[PDB]
Design a protein around this ligand. Structure first.
Ligand SMILES: O=C(O)CNC(=O)C(=O)O
Ligand SMILES: [Mg+2]
Ligand code: NI
Ligand SMILES: [Zn+2]
Length: 331
């Protein structure tokens, strides 16, 4: 069995190997990458996402989210307070302001310490889930807006024909902006490219141990657990590495830098935070190996998780028994 300790693997594809996306995902899996839940892909030196970023301040963040925490430093939830629209230029200036900027620090480890110590005492503002792409249309390799769609994968594998589309999203982060512990919708893969700016630290639980994390989460958030049998779908709960280690939950950590891709694998729980102003792009995708995870994915039916249009068909086809209840939670 490859990668039995479920370590995060880092890949350095050549330009030739970067041509065929699906093939390279399958390659990484042949080496056991998926067992970690997360992999890093460093593009060949000859590749570029786009020529420059010199013109990104005009993008609009229609609904910036202030991430307000409740709990204790290592175990907290966050809610998103909607703020008034702002441009990327406005947001970048805010990120760099004394109130929100990254503190002095020695190295990534010191900064991680400061994050876990102090996150809860601040409410950073996140520009998340903005439909769009910053890849140049002429970038042919690993262009997140030119991937094969999840609908087409399900059609190819299963023969059914469904509505729905699959487009990328932009994320504009600042110091302490936080992504809570989650898997993807329908336990899909995700791919994330850090276009520019400061790093993003990731934590991940191996898919084969995801239920260990869920059990701890039920213990740590007992009211939330009573409200919903899949409340990590709400994407609001944080648990620190110290707490995970105290409770024997297997995990790994890695820091993604600008110019790097990360892939999350089906049912790989992940969480993390941004080091300072940055911009990432991400999208869900599927492979044949996903289909079995899609069929088994938990679902939130309490109404909190509310998701895209395109998830309807996935539930309807892969989880017909669950469809009626889940759709009530959508409606
Ligand atoms: O970048 C972020 O804030 C969150 N991204 C993801 O959870 C992902 O790419 O799957
Ligand atoms: Mg612009
Ligand atoms: Ni994710
Ligand atoms: Zn729920």
């Amino acid at each position: 069995a490859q990668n039995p300790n479920c370590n995060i693997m880092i890949f350095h594809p050549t330009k030739e190997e970067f041509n065929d996306f699906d093939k390279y995902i399958a390659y990484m899996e042949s080496q056991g990458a998926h067992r970690a839940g997360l992999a890093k892909i460093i593009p060949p030196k000859e590749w570029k996402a786009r020529e420059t970023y010199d013109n990104i301040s005009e993008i609009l963040i229609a609904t910036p989210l202030q991430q307000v925490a409740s709990g204790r430093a290592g175990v907290f939830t966050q809610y998103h307070k909607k703020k008034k629209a702002m441009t990327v230029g406005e947001y970048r200036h805010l990120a760099n302001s004394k109130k929100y900027q990254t503190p002095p620090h020695q190295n990534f480890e010191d900064l991680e310490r400061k994050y876990w110590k102090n996150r809860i005492y601040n409410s950073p503002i996140y520009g998340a889930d903005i439909s769009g792409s910053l890849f140049d249309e002429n970038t042919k390799q690993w262009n997140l807006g030119h991937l094969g769609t999840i609908q087409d994968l399900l059609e190819k594998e299963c023969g059914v024909v469904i509505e729905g589309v699959n487009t990328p999203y932009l994320y504009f982060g600042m110091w302490k902006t936080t992504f809570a512990w989650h898997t993807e919708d329908m336990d899909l893969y995700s791919i994330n490219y850090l276009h520019l700016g400061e790093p993003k630290t990731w934590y991940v639980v191996p898919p084969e141990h995801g239920q260990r994390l869920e059990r701890l989460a039920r213990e740590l958030f007992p009211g939330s657990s009573r409200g919903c049998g899949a409340f990590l779908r709400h994407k609001v709960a944080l648990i620190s590495p110290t707490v995970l280690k105290e409770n024997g939950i297997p995990f790994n950590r890695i820091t993604q830098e600008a110019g790097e891709f990360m892939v999350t694998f089906p049912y790989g729980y992940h969480a993390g935070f941004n080091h300072g102003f940055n911009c990432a792009e991400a999208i869900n995708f599927a492979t044949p190996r996903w289909i079995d995870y899609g069929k088994m994915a938990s679902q939130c039916s309490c109404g909190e998780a509310r998701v895209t249009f395109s998830m309807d068909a996935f539930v309807r086809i892969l989880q017909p028994e669950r469809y009626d209840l889940w759709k009530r939670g959508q409606d």
